[PDB]
Write a protein that binds this DNA or RNA. Structure first.
Lengths: 56, 73
DNA sequence: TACACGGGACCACA
DNA sequence: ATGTGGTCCCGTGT
């Protein structure tokens, strides 16, 4: 249990599979950032993009 | 088994039970899934929906294209 | 303990 | 054939 979170579309899993195109780029960010776990790269990417998230 | 792709490289899957490709990175072959913590998964799945994207990977693409400036630094 | 991460296998699908 | 997104079970570690 606990591997789901409550989203606006229902319960969704915390493990998600990135496309090869996306994974190549996303792992680059994580590796460049030198983070141990990839979730932390997402926290960053997100925070480094509030400006836009704020629109829409 | 290596295979060239736009922006990087891919490794063909070895076993017959799973035929999922891995991507080659700076620390070697890597599986393409990623687990996110709960807090992160909640804010991530928000953005995803605010873009109305079906697939999470398309919101990670958006986020990257949107942090391009940062990334490159 | 409780929660977390990620490898392996897997189903439905194209 | 061989890829795909996505999920389950479990070994291991915080």
């Amino acid at each position: 249990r606990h591997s789901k979170v409550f989203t606006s579309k229902g319960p969704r899993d915390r493990r998600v599979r990135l496309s090869a195109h996306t994974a190549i780029q996303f792992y680059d960010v994580q590796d460049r950032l030198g983070y141990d776990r990839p979730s932390k790269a997402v926290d960053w990417l997100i925070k480094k993009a509030k400006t836009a998230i704020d629109k829409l | 088994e290596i295979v060239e792709v736009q922006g990087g490289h891919i490794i063909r899957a070895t076993g017959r039970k799973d035929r999922h490709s891995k991507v080659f990175t700076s620390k070697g072959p890597r599986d393409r899934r990623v687990r996110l913590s709960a807090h992160t998964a909640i804010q991530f799945y928000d953005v995803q929906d605010r873009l109305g994207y079906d697939r999470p990977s398309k919101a990670v693409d958006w986020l990257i294209k949107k942090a391009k400036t940062a990334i490159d630094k």
